[PDB]
């Protein structure tokens, strides 16, 4: 243990806004590539304040967007980000 997923914690400061790559998406959340092996899911609400049907409206496959790293769940190999807070801070 204490490898890649951990490595993020020891390498990236939480709360910073970082450009990632939206590789995959689904109607409830989108997956951004921040570091190899960890993908950040962004809830449909974190995308926009209005009715978003599918993340594709805002972020499609291959989208490179700076998002705020709000949390890191390295024990579940997950990472949390929100475009709302990215614009907020």
**CATH number, position 45:** 2.40.50.140
Helix (H) or strand (E) segment spanning residue 88 = helix 83-88
Tokens at 69, concatenated: 């790293």
CB-neighbour burial class of residue 2 (10 A; exposed 0-12, middle 13-18, buried 19+)? exposed
The answer to whether the beta carbons of residues 58 and 83 sit under 8 Å apart is: yes
Sign of the C-alpha dihedral computed for residues 43, 47, 31 and 54 taken in this order: positive
Q: Structural domain tally of the chain?
A: 1
**Which residue in this structure is represented by tokens 């609400």?**
45
CB-neighbour burial class of residue 69 (10 A; exposed 0-12, middle 13-18, buried 19+)? buried
What's the rounded Cα separation, in Å, for the pair 49 and 73?
Answer: 25
The whole domain housing 13 covers 1-89
**Which residue in this structure is represented by tokens 């709302």?**
84
The answer to whether the beta carbons of residues 61 and 20 sit under 8 Å apart is: no
């Amino acid at each position: 243990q204490e490898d890649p997923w951990r490595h993020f914690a020891r390498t990236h400061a939480i709360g910073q806004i970082v450009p990632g790559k939206v590789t995959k998406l689904v109607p409830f959340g989108a997956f951004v590539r921040v570091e190899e092996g960890i993908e950040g899911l962004v809830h449909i609400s974190e995308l926009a304040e209005r009715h978003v049907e599918v993340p594709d409206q805002v972020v499609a496959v291959g989208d490179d967007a700076m998002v705020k790293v709000i949390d890191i769940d390295l024990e579940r190999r997950r990472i949390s980000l929100s475009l709302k807070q990215a614009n907020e801070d």
